[PDB]
Amino acid sequence: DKTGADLWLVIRTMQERLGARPVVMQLPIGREDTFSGIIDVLRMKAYTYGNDLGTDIREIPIPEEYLDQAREYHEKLVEVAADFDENIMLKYLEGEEPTEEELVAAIRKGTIDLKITPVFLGSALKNKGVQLLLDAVVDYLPSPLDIPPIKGTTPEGEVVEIHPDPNGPLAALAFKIMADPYVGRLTFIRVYSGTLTSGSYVYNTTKGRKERVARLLRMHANHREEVEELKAGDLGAVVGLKETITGDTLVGEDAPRVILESIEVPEPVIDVAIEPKTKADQEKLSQALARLAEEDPTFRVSTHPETGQTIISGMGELHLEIIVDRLKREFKVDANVGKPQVAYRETITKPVDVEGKFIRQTGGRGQYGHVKIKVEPLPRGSGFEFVNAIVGGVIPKEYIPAVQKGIEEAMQSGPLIGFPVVDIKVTLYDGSYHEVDSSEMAFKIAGSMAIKEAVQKGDPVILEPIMRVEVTTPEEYMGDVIGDLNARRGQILGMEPRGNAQVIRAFVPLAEMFGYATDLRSKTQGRGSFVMFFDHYQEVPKQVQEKLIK
Amino acid sequence: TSYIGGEGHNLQEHSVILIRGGRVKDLPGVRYHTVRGALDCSGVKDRKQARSKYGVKRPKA
Amino acid sequence: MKVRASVKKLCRNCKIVKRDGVIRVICSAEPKHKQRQG
Amino acid sequence: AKKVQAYVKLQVAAGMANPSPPVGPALGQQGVNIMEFCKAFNAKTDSIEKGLPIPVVITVYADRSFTFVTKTPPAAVLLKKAAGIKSGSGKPNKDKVGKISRAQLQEIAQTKAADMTGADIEAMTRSIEGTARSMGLVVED
RNA sequence: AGCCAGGAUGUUGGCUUAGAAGCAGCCAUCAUUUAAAGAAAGCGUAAUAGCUCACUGGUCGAGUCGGCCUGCGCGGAAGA
């Protein structure tokens, strides 16, 4: 009924976009503002609507004109239904009309196979096409029986169908917990086998727990119908149970302690930096997820393994956003929300060679250690390599371990900002010692000095993290998709087509890669998706060198 | 403050633990132990003897 | 448009007119190429 | 010889016969199949050979599959397995890089019974001599 | 100058090419058939691109193009 409301236009898309085999099941009388009645081809009957309050309806025959338009669509329908019932096929060509009962059987036996999609219509606000869509329900919508059995696994290990027989083992899945003020914890469940019973005992294999279901309950659109049992294929809520969180498999209290499938894998796409202000809030936050992570396992919490700050795994802007209201409100926590940091690395360009001296001779524990090394940069992604390059043994055998633990060590705080100075090869080619003064330790320092300076001297370079990304996009949007990525300090790598879509691979800096979801979904109106992996570290464009001196 | 007993623990900033009474006469001002295998605390990888302390499940034999 | 002491044909589709008494650039293909006060 | 309506060219060889990595999804995403491609494809590809880069027609209207009458390979596809380098350029004019000849790719240019301008097979002879010199080679012609 | 036309062949061009098939990038700037068509002019696709160009035919039918020397003018030009 709303302007631009063109039925066809949809179908001109439902096969143009996704591309299925929909079937015109109705033709509206009065396109848009002139929304009166409607017509069902299959049953060639016409109904009408005199109002929008949903009262003055009626099945009034076709209004003069129109009529003709029908037929053909009621023929194609039957012609369509033909690809299912040979009976509704011959009778077609012979000149007989399929029975209103065998005709339905075709459509129905056809949808259920995911081959066709019966299209109907009507202003839901004006109460139109609803009572007819409802018939559309039963008439073509599958029954808990017409559907393919759930697989589960025995305690031993082997797949197996779960039969919808309300007399086999009891097998039910859970899917939604809710706190009721009147009856408390509610656990809506979909039964598959056996039959749950009011005032019994169940068993959740998932968390090996004996739950005691006390009361069964069915939600009626306006009251609490308290029933006595849910037989396989039926849905409702149980009252009792405490350890039963989402996706839980409940069997009889003796049945094969089996576990259904359920395995869904919707990981994240967008994260944020959450620093809980003074250590005070850092707690309110712990509890925050300690209950929020059960009330929605559609996220992930992680403490950045390199810098305190914790990440908040989401599945789209809004997602994390509205958590930020509850986690900050219904938890009164008030922290910070900026963006993650980047795991940088230090290293050098030119190879150097400096002295590592220590000696402290005043009178006793002399402390005498000294060494010379050969520092040389290695390919971005080389690692750590030292060199026991001591001839006869100017540097005793027993002290090398320690002169390494010293070099290895020092490499912790970079010469520039203080990050893991990596990607280099070290060569100990000299250094002397003292008979009495030297110490395992005295050397660990001297060597931790030779290094603490070769990097300062060999011109340091602030390396950074590069990612591997693959945006799946219809080459429709592609054009800009690649652009945007270029203007992101990134350099493209290719696009080997996929399905109707096309994939793009390339590298990027984690800094200039934040909140990419809501940027990709921008250049693609939604038809865009990406992945991401690590690869290597690489120099910052110098302009970003003095930038980081923070 | 609290000891984290055992060899190797996966604990960090923000980790909620449970802790019991038990000083560590060696470190000063450590009058408590972290209860391995409690809330966020982990049982110790690979342990075999004395598992119940150190929070480690009887390995599926 | 840009208004400025040195107006020039930018692309090959700029034309330079004068109207009233004022040198302007028109350009069929480039709104940005519009110019005044030449 | 008519007008627009159905043709792509984006392969890796007659070797790989319908892959999804360096191509794949849009190997057929409008009226062509990610699957059809050892059918009308290998209607002769493995009868004769799988080991030279070659695309082919699509000829699309509204008749289930396609009528892409298939055919020839490029002319630096035979600068790897018939003349020279398996990649090529390097530093292309920083010197002579590589080097071919006249014999080198006569009967190698000479086969195509489907493509080339002119019965003069001295003219469409040196017609391919610079697909090898789009890389910067030497002329032992 | 309009207008009616053509705008190609190796070559989807080899290529540190994830995908390039002229395009920030690759190098050179050579090379086939024609009336003539640039391994390159463009706003610019997920790529095949669709659509105009530099360059060529027809039409029309006598003028047309823009450097130099000089005169007078024009914009550049807002204050209590």
Swiss-Prot record, chain B:
The modification N6-acetyllysine is found at residue 45. Transmembrane segments: none annotated. The modification 3-methylthioaspartic acid is found at residue 26. It comes from the Bacteria. Part of the 30S ribosomal subunit. Contacts proteins S8 and S17. Interacts with ArfA. May interact with IF1 in the 30S initiation complex. With S4 and S5 plays an important role in translational accuracy. At least 19 substitutions or deletions in 11 codons can promote streptomycin resistance, dependence or pseudodependence; all but one of the streptomycin resistant mutations (K42R) are associated with hyperaccurate translation and thus reduced translational efficiency. Belongs to the universal ribosomal protein uS12 family. This is Small ribosomal subunit protein uS12. The gene is rpsL. The chain holds residues 64 to 124 of 124 of the full protein.
Swiss-Prot record, chain C:
GO terms for molecular function: rRNA binding; structural constituent of ribosome. One of its GO terms (cellular component) is cytosolic large ribosomal subunit. Pfam families: Ribosomal_L36. Keywords: Ribonucleoprotein, Ribosomal protein, RNA-binding, rRNA-binding. It comes from the Bacteria. InterPro entries: Ribosomal_bL36 (IPR000473), Ribosomal_bL36_sp (IPR035977). Disulfide bonds: none annotated. GO terms for biological process: cytoplasmic translation; translation. The keyword RNA-binding applies. Belongs to the bacterial ribosomal protein bL36 family. HAMAP family: Ribosomal_bL36. Part of the 50S ribosomal subunit. One of the last ribosomal proteins to be assembled in the 50S subunit, it contacts a number of helices in the 23S rRNA, acting as molecular glue. The simultaneous presence of uL16 and bL36 probably triggers ObgE's GTPase activity and eventual dissociation from the mature 50S ribosomal subunit. This is Large ribosomal subunit protein bL36A. It comes from Escherichia coli (strain K12). The lineage of its organism: Bacteria, Pseudomonadati, Pseudomonadota, Gammaproteobacteria, Enterobacterales. The gene is rpmJ.
Curated annotation (Swiss-Prot), chain D:
PROSITE patterns: RIBOSOMAL_L11. It comes from the Bacteria. The modification N,N,N-trimethylalanine is found at residue 1. CDD domains: Ribosomal_L11 (cd00349). Keywords: Methylation, Ribonucleoprotein, Ribosomal protein, RNA-binding, rRNA-binding. One of its GO terms (biological process) is translational termination. The modification N6-succinyllysine is found at residues 71, 80. PANTHER family: 60S RIBOSOMAL PROTEIN L12 (PTHR11661), LARGE RIBOSOMAL SUBUNIT PROTEIN UL11M (PTHR11661:SF1). Belongs to the universal ribosomal protein uL11 family. Forms part of the ribosomal stalk which helps the ribosome interact with GTP-bound translation factors. Part of the ribosomal stalk of the 50S ribosomal subunit. Interacts with L10 and the large rRNA to form the base of the stalk. L10 forms an elongated spine to which 2 L12 dimers bind in a sequential fashion forming a pentameric L10(L12)2(L12)2 complex. This is Large ribosomal subunit protein uL11. It comes from Escherichia coli (strain K12).
